[PDB]
Symmetry: C5
Subunit: 332 residues, 5 copies
Amino acid sequence: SEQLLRIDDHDFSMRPGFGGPAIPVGVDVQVESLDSISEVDMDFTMTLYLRHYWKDERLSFPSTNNLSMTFDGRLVKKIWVPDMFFVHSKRSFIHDTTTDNVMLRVQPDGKVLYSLRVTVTAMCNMDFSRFPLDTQTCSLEIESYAYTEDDLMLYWKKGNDSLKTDERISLSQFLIQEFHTTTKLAFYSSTGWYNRLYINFTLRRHIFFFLLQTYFPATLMVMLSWVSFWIDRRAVPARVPLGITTVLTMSTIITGVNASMPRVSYIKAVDIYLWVSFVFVFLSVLEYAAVNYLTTVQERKEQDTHAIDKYSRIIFPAAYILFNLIYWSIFS
Amino acid sequence: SEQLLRIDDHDFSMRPGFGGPAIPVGVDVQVESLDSISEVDMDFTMTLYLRHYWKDERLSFPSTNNLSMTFDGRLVKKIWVPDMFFVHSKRSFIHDTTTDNVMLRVQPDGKVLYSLRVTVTAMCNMDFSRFPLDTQTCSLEIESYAYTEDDLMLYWKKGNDSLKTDERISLSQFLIQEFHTTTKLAFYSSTGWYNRLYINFTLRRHIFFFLLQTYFPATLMVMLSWVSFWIDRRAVPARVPLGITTVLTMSTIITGVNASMPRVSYIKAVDIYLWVSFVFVFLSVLEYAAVNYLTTVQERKEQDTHAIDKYSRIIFPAAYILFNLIYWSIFS
Amino acid sequence: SEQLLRIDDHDFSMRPGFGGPAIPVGVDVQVESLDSISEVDMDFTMTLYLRHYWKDERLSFPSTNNLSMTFDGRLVKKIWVPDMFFVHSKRSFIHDTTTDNVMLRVQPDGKVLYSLRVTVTAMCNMDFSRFPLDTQTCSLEIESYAYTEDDLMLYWKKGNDSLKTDERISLSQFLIQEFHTTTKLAFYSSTGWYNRLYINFTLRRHIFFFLLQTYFPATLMVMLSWVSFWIDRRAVPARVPLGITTVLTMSTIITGVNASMPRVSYIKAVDIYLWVSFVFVFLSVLEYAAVNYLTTVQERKEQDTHAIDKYSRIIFPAAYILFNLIYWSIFS
Amino acid sequence: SEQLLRIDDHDFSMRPGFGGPAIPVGVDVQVESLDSISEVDMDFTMTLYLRHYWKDERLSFPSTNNLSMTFDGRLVKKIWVPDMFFVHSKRSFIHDTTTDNVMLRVQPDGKVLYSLRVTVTAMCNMDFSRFPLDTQTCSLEIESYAYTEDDLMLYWKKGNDSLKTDERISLSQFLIQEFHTTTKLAFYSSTGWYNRLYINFTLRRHIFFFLLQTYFPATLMVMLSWVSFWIDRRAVPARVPLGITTVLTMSTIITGVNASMPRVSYIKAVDIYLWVSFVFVFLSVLEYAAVNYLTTVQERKEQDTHAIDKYSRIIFPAAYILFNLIYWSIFS
Amino acid sequence: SEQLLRIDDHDFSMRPGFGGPAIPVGVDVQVESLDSISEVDMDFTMTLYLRHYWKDERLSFPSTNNLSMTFDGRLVKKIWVPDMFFVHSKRSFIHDTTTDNVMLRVQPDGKVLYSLRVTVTAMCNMDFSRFPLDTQTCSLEIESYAYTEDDLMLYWKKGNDSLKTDERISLSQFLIQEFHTTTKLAFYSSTGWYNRLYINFTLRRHIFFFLLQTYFPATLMVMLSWVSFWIDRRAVPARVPLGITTVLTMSTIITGVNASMPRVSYIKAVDIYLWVSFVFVFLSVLEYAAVNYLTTVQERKEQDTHAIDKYSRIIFPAAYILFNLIYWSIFS
Ligand SMILES: CCCCCCCC
Ligand SMILES: CCCCCCCC
Ligand SMILES: CCCCCCCC
Ligand SMILES: CCCCCCCC
Ligand SMILES: CCCCCCCC
Ligand SMILES: CCCCCCCC
Ligand SMILES: CCCCCCCC
Ligand SMILES: CCCCCCCC
Ligand SMILES: CCCCCCCC
Ligand SMILES: CCCCCCCC
Ligand SMILES: CCCCCCCC
Ligand SMILES: CCCCCCCC
Ligand SMILES: CCCCCCCC
Ligand SMILES: CCCCCCCC
Ligand SMILES: CCCCCCCC
Ligand SMILES: CCCCCCCC
Ligand SMILES: CCCCCCCC
Ligand SMILES: CCCCCCCC
Ligand SMILES: CCCCCCCC
Ligand SMILES: CCCCCCCC
Ligand SMILES: NC[C@H](O)CC(=O)O
Ligand SMILES: NC[C@H](O)CC(=O)O
Ligand SMILES: NC[C@H](O)CC(=O)O
Ligand SMILES: NC[C@H](O)CC(=O)O
Ligand SMILES: NC[C@H](O)CC(=O)O
Ligand SMILES: CCCCCC
Ligand SMILES: CCCCCC
Ligand SMILES: CCCCCC
Ligand SMILES: CCCCCC
Ligand SMILES: CCCCCC
Ligand SMILES: CCCCCC
Ligand SMILES: [Cl-]
């Protein structure tokens, strides 16, 4: 094998066909798993198989079998091999247990297949201002490092059919949909033009979990705060603790929701809901102070429900309804 | 030794017997420990010994002893060795202190034994919708990377007896049961067919700890909320703070249970329990407002227990009982 | 190629032109992304491309094409290459998947271009005493390790135009502004003088998020504490729980704000706001004790609003206003 | 030196004396520090020096000095060296700054000394059911990987005197006592018999810190709940809030103790204490409801302390005392 | 250069002058930064430059220039170099981007200078029983690994002037003071005597931040608890909730201070303060129960301030004052 190929009779720092046109190289990918997601750092981790095809007649051998052979890794450092890399990546590695996950098959003609197994972490810019009703889209990019479109030609081996995805892929916090591929040509100011391949996909959440954990308790709190309009205004020590305890409860809920968020420092769509229900509860406590002050001054002036109570009984819910209509018209 | 074997007289990039049938290779495993589990990331970590057997007559030597020899590691890179790898793995390594944990024994015939010590992290898809009453099953998969069933034949060396497990294995959060092995043939669209080996096992939790920490306090809270049906309706400042303080207490408990969960964003079987006891406590606070409003309007109209109290005393517990029956009929 | 260049006919431990003047070396940078920031550890992480230019006539070759060639990495360890390093850095590495991200281009003259892809973590001293109204500025420094200004001359290749920045750069907690470059000469007491290059930039926060999360609820709490001046002093069991519950609420808010801060142990500008509103709420609770004690002793002496109430109704808000004026005159 | 020893005249893949009996190899250890402990993962980290002694007459040299020489590391890969490894370990490494921490001394006879500096993480099964009154014992195990008791003989160089421990060893959460060594012979089903060395030690906690942080506040809460037996039963709005606020306080304490525990999911000895004091506080709130209901029905029937109060004043503390006696008789 | 020095004509496994006396080697250090501190693990991280000087006439070359040359790294593995290491260290490394941060300068005589750039984590035993009023001192130790005082002599190159410290060094949680150096001779029982160098320094905190965050709110709580001595004893429903709410508030504060401490399990000087103010608040709640019980029994016996109130008004503060005097006499 090491003899079948005239390894010492050629020069492999030289791309196959240095001189005239660019070498065609064709790519095939199969995704094994998506491993983790960070919302704070804005990135994701994926593990896949990567395959390459090309022809190099320096590697042809005399056999009659019309069938391929096999090598692994050691030969990659003797021969010439392409040099793809992952664009917009934070870290990556190739697996090496119990030996290097690298495969090499060569036919009599010198046609070649070359394959690896890798894990990549790759950046994805996200926007959380519609949280928890956001949708995100991410991508993985592949490019040649050293050779430009004048020396190497990059393309998907079988067009739209060059991506395969494993059956058992899932996340404990997301739903994954819409895998597909595309291409684009890209330019560097000090080095030139290159071809680039993409893999795209889309993410969404489970909205009912967030509904019950956040929107439901605050609504029950705002509804608890309307009870005070139906209690006798003469019962001061039963109308005064109620409001302030309700404020305490709502502040506890809001604090509890703040101590578990992914810690991204700009205003999002649930913060608005929570702070508006805080303001409603606060107004309910101003109301009864108005009523008490007026009843007391009347008592002093002289020496039945109050108008403000029987008006609040109507006004407060209608305005909560009006707020909910507008809010869900804006975030749908 | 390096001379006993004609190392320079052979070619080891070539599998033993390149040409005709596939080489038989036989595997034996002993598990040392399970090291950690992640429920958020859905994976586990294990450490084991791995052993291989095969015959290669390029390694035979003239001795009369009918007994094996020993080498370690350096020789592995001179001779031909198989290339197994762990399928659906996130990371792994071989231990190297104070030197490489690799052993090699060769007999006069050229029969070989080869062994390593490794640690692997490996994915396991879990479903937590029955939490804390869930059960999970995981597995470790082993496969050849480079050679197909037409070049290498993978099998357990002794059938069902090829797995051994250490005596002192345990986790601080789980109970481990049912180790066994099996096999399956698997297919890759761009490379072909391979043999694969499995090791399976099962996990369960301690249910009484979760019972006392979560289900018990909420039940005592719902039972505390029924006390208010037996207090005099004329005692407004002693019936009004009770309910709202009880709501405060229950919200504190629920928040405390949310700040320690493994953070998996979909609805699970304990969330339902907690939110239904929240709704019961909320209804208890609506009840006394009904009673107060009615007594007040009667006082105004004119100028003994109330029916609603003596009806609630019966209705509320029966419905809690009915909820518990249905809930534990569904989750058993 | 390895032959075109007389590799074995020269000595590369020797800088080009050892002897007379210093070699000119010129630098070009393109920033890909800012990856993370730590406020506790005072540092940041960046990923970029780095490019070098120089001439070495040991690498010239006879060709007529007036056009460059290509190599990658392996050649870097055969020839002489500069040795820049990142000053005030905690950690860094060069990417190596699927091979080393290193490029090398040589023209017939022996002019050279050399480029890498790296990730660096680099220290930045920050001062948080104006938090959340702070502004920070950071920088990345580049220097030669081994050769002084008498052997190597470091400069930007194109002056102000030698820095390029990617379009899609962002952080989930900051706004980035004002990239520019400069230079400075620097001195080591036991080794001598060197040239150094800088890249500078500036950071700011989103102030409205911090406003709503911190300053707003405490203000509503201080305003809730003024309600007690308008309730009848004869209603002791409705004036005594109010203050103490309000104290409870404010302490809960402050504790909630302390359990999420970046944990830097010196006094900052929001702590002052929070503790002054604590002191206001505390004084409101001392006030009514004064009023109760005086009314009781008058009752005992003998056997209408009180002056202190109708004075507090004016004094407390004016002093809160006066505090806000001074505070926002100091932090603007 | 490299010449003094006839390196190229011998074969070092071959243990000294391959053939007849087993080589004696003798071990000496000095512990530098214990570095960290994990209670969740059940393991510890230690750093030490390790020393070996043996004789190999392939390394003898003609000198008259009767005194040893020195080498470092590079020679270890030319000559034959033993292959010990740490049994039941999760990770380890040898230090390499500013070069490899390896020492080698050889005398004229061929006697050898060989030493390293390493850090190891090693598993320790713990049982926390007596927490905070638990005691744990851990150990570090040392074994040959490749050679059995028929090829290598492992023993402590000086018996009980072969372990030394540094003066300045401590943990910020434990007290360390009782270092000693021992040996045992161990068996592998597919490879055979080996010798193994042990180092053992013991751990304990500071019990008074846990006492004040956990047992003290709950006791004061249970004692606060007995005050309600001495207040007038006619004071409903002063007897009804007291109990429920006390329940709130105790639930806050318990939640605070749950949010800081090492997160091991089975019942431990402090959980029992906390939940029994919860049940006592709950019964105190049922008591006054009994008293109120009875007084009210008597008032209705007709139209002085109550017996239940003056009985509870005696019964509740005695039963708390009886619980404490039994509890501290069981956990001592 | 590689020729100027007769590399192949000498033996470098042999220290310069093997035989007679010990080689003098002299050390110079410059500290770049202190990077982080762990109070739980008791250690710190530092980054510095390290320099060595010695003479070796195997490296002399014929030149007339009386001036030094330069090499980098590759030569270190051809020639003989010392072998210093950091004593009591947990981890360390040498920086290698964009190449190895190693410098080598040789003069015609064979005098040598050798320098590196490293980061070290190093243990420091701390005692927190005076927290937050503690002071700590730490050190970094440097020693030869392989050679004893009979083969190598270690000393500071310029005495007290051999340490330089960067201008821009700081921590976000500490103040750093008092850098200085010293030396000591040290002994190993199985290997012998060595020289060791030290760098020492001192740390302190910001005490006013801890004062406002911890001591201030508890004091205001103890002062709030004295208000109850001035309210009318006839106002039961206004004297009974006050105490218990105050207890709730103080327990919340203490829990909040426990959920952010560096988690070191022994009693410290702030714990005492907090638990004594807890006991004061608890006694204030026992007091009014005494007063109520006595007034009630007098009412029953028959059918103005109470003595206990007008005595407590004096006794409680004086004892708080007396506690503060003693406490701050003990911790100063
Ligand atoms: C499935 C639970 C839905 C809760 C909706 C609450 C809207 C305020
Ligand atoms: C919001 C509570 C209103 C209760 C009205 C009851 C009328 C029967
Ligand atoms: C960007 C608008 C924020 C509005 C916040 C309102 C809070 C009551
Ligand atoms: C928000 C309710 C206002 C009610 C005003 C009533 C004036 C008589
Ligand atoms: C062993 C404790 C069981 C608690 C059961 C509580 C069910 C509500
Ligand atoms: C739920 C408390 C009921 C108390 C009834 C007592 C009858 C003696
Ligand atoms: C998927 C059904 C959720 C029901 C939640 C009910 C909460 C009261
Ligand atoms: C859920 C209790 C309802 C009671 C209704 C009573 C109507 C008289
Ligand atoms: C957009 C919200 C602003 C809130 C300002 C609060 C100032 C106390
Ligand atoms: C701070 C509340 C004052 C209420 C006054 C109402 C006058 C109509
Ligand atoms: C450095 C001045 C701090 C002032 C704190 C005041 C808290 C009421
Ligand atoms: C801070 C308010 C003081 C009011 C004093 C009134 C004296 C009659
Ligand atoms: C040193 C404090 C001891 C506290 C004991 C509390 C027992 C309930
Ligand atoms: C294993 C016995 C648990 C008992 C728990 C009792 C809680 C009141
Ligand atoms: C636990 C106290 C029970 C008291 C019963 C009294 C019956 C008259
Ligand atoms: C600068 C604030 C000092 C606070 C001292 C509090 C002492 C109890
Ligand atoms: C601790 C509050 C005492 C108030 C006394 C007021 C005397 C005018
Ligand atoms: C070591 C003495 C501890 C004293 C604790 C006192 C708590 C009230
Ligand atoms: C538990 C408080 C009892 C108080 C009794 C006081 C008798 C003088
Ligand atoms: C701690 C205050 C004690 C007061 C005792 C008064 C006895 C008449
Ligand atoms: N295709 C990668 C670029 O050529 C690298 C660079 O920007 O230098
Ligand atoms: N058995 C592993 C596969 O052959 C690797 C790949 O998918 O290329
Ligand atoms: N330019 C880096 C310095 O020369 C290194 C050192 O301080 O020794
Ligand atoms: N002594 C280590 C064992 O021989 C390794 C294995 O189990 O194969
Ligand atoms: N100076 C380091 C010691 O010689 C190493 C050891 O203890 O063996
Ligand atoms: C917040 C409600 C105020 C009503 C004044 C009449
Ligand atoms: C929630 C109970 C309402 C009862 C109305 C009669
Ligand atoms: C804190 C207010 C005190 C007023 C005394 C007249
Ligand atoms: C929980 C105490 C009940 C007493 C009934 C007489
Ligand atoms: C705790 C104070 C008790 C006073 C008894 C007279
Ligand atoms: C009324 C006496 C108060 C004393 C405070 C020290
Ligand atoms: Cl009342």
